[PDB]
Design an enzyme around this catalytic site. Sequence first.
Site, PDB file in Angstrom:
ATOM      1  N   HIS A 279      14.969  -6.768  -3.389  1.00  0.00           N
ATOM      2  CA  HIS A 279      14.191  -5.688  -3.994  1.00  0.00           C
ATOM      3  C   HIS A 279      14.484  -5.468  -5.442  1.00  0.00           C
ATOM      4  O   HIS A 279      13.572  -5.473  -6.272  1.00  0.00           O
ATOM      5  CB  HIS A 279      14.340  -4.368  -3.254  1.00  0.00           C
TER       6      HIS A 279
ATOM      7  N   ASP B 276       8.976  -0.761  -8.274  1.00  0.00           N
ATOM      8  CA  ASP B 276       9.329   0.313  -7.319  1.00  0.00           C
ATOM      9  C   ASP B 276       8.507   1.577  -7.669  1.00  0.00           C
ATOM     10  O   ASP B 276       7.293   1.488  -7.884  1.00  0.00           O
ATOM     11  CB  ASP B 276      10.871   0.515  -7.385  1.00  0.00           C
ATOM     12  N   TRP B 277       9.141   2.742  -7.782  1.00  0.00           N
ATOM     13  CA  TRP B 277       8.393   3.956  -8.145  1.00  0.00           C
ATOM     14  C   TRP B 277       7.809   3.890  -9.533  1.00  0.00           C
ATOM     15  O   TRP B 277       6.820   4.557  -9.845  1.00  0.00           O
ATOM     16  CB  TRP B 277       9.268   5.179  -7.943  1.00  0.00           C
TER      17      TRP B 277
ATOM     18  N   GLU C 201       7.988  -6.294  -7.032  1.00  0.00           N
ATOM     19  CA  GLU C 201       8.546  -5.430  -5.986  1.00  0.00           C
ATOM     20  C   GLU C 201       7.996  -3.999  -6.125  1.00  0.00           C
ATOM     21  O   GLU C 201       8.737  -3.007  -6.280  1.00  0.00           O
ATOM     22  CB  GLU C 201      10.078  -5.516  -5.985  1.00  0.00           C
TER      23      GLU C 201
ATOM     24  N   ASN D 250      13.393   4.135  -7.992  1.00  0.00           N
ATOM     25  CA  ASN D 250      14.541   4.708  -7.279  1.00  0.00           C
ATOM     26  C   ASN D 250      15.526   3.607  -6.898  1.00  0.00           C
ATOM     27  O   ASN D 250      15.091   2.506  -6.558  1.00  0.00           O
ATOM     28  CB  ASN D 250      14.035   5.402  -6.011  1.00  0.00           C
TER      29      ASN D 250
HETATM   30 CL   LIG Z   1      12.292   5.232  -2.425  1.00  0.00          CL
END
Ligand SMILES: [Cl-]
EC number: 3.8.1.5
Length: 294
Positions: A271, A107-108, A131, A37
């Site tokens: 990030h 991330d996701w 990350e 995301n």
């Molecule tokens: Cl998120």
Amino acid sequence: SLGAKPFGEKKFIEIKGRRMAYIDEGTGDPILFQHGNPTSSYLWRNIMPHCAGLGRLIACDLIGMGDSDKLDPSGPERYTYAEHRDYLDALWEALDLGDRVVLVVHDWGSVLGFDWARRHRERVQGIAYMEAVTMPLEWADFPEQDRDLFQAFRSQAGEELVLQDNVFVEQVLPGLILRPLSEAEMAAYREPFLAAGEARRPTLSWPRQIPIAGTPADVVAIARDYAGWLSESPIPKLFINAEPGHLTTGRMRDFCRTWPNQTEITVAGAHFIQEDSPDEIGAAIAAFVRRLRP
Ligand SMILES: [Cl-]
Ligand SMILES: [Ca+2]
Ligand SMILES: [Cl-]
């Protein structure tokens, strides 16, 4: 190098009656790059070229993101982790990846990729991650400065912030990149989310799904499962650490640093580190793959 141009050509395939978009370039065993995301395959555009000729280079756009179809009818119950996994599992099956896959995750994309790897472990040749959600979170593990905002996403305030005002794309995203993005770069990130309302739902459903302090229970259990597995798996790993970093710091990083058979480098970034150190990241992934594929 840096640059705003996407890597390769977007291809499309029908999955569960929806069209999903993806990049698929070159031949051989896949090197599979997964965004999270509020990004898309675009996140990897300056990283993937480093792996040219080292395998089949694939980057999929998650459902409702990038050039992939929106779910309709969309609403507060759509775009859960479970729903994304159904689409991505089906896309990855359709792509005929074979049994020596290198995953590159963020991330996701890391929750999805780590979970897929756990479930398909015989087919995973290496895992490169950065990350990432290395395990379920407690609030103490969520970066302090962004706690209030993410708590607001996970409240009734989330629809106004995200669906109406596009806060994840317009505030969180550049806020966690150290160098200034160009007009063209932000245009590419904004494009799937230009329209207010449900078009932006994936970018709100995601923060609502983060496994934090036991909620949501299903994603917590999935992350607990892959955390235990990764901590014991002899599959070779590349951990791209970041300075200052963001999510994968503190106990999140203490934990993943215990994982077996792992190489680590540190690059500059918060990030979305792909936008700060793409060549250092690409060089490390390419070297990792060369060692995996002599
Ligand atoms: Cl998120
Ligand atoms: Ca910034
Ligand atoms: Cl083979």
